[PDB]
Amino acid sequence: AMLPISMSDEGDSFLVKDSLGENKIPKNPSKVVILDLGILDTFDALKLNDKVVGVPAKNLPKYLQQFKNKPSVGGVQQVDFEAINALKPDLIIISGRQSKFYDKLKEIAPTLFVGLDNANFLSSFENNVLSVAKLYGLEKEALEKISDIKNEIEKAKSIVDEDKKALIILTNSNKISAFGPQSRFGIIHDVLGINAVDENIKVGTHGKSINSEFILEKNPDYIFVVDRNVILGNKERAQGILDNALVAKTKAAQNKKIIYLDPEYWYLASGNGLESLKTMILEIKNAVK
Ligand SMILES: O=C(NCCCCCNC(=O)c1cccc(O)c1O)c1cccc(O)c1O
Ligand SMILES: [Fe+3]
User: How many angstroms does the Cα of residue 97 sit away from the middle of ligand 2?
Assistant: First the structure.
């Protein structure tokens, strides 16, 4: 399991260790650059909008449009290091997309890593939210919002059909990639308990390459689709790629259970937010109930 965030109260600050290192972070930091879009939604959920100084506006989701008048620090995969420096942040919050630039960011300001653990989603999710909340004295508000999400999980689980199997795919340009348990989208199988049509899909960041013959041979009952074209600004769309004669023969296609999941939540936020995760849970529940 990934190392959790642990914190010591230092009066005016906390001394914080995460899997990438140690930082001293001020209490109530007033100028936070946020590069994980999930955590951006947690800031909103805890009414901390004014504490945000900079966001990756290249990849700012439609659901986070209230942050459209914050200064941009570029995109999640194209960080603007000069902009970050100019906003004089007290804290920079990053996840796995920026771990390779940890040292460079940390020369600028204290840099907190909030990656999710694909093997331990909920544990890491709670530790991320509670760590952030602790910085602001908001553990009570945060714990209530977690409890609400856990209650939504239970409700969702109780409607799942034990005799149906799902496949999770990512579409990119014309190409299709598969994801299963313990992947970046694994909450479908690991948290909500929908069975996997293929339990031996090897975990990788951008999935494992497949084609529509694979999808037909598996014949899943549900296909959950994540359209990375939307995120990249490509012209292609998953609807077009999957509207072929082999996919049409699946049970999923037949029962109108090809479900196009919003990739701003699933691919960008990755459920690493109080708002995003609740919305995502409801989107699965409403697709399969
Ligand atoms: O290290 C990563 N990517 C390196 C670049 C991959 C190749 C270029 N991709 C893009 O242009 C792109 C743009 C926006 C969001 C993304 O996630 C993208 O992959 C990475 C890490 C975790 C999650 C991801 O998803 C990542 O990518
Ligand atoms: Fe990516």
Answer: 7
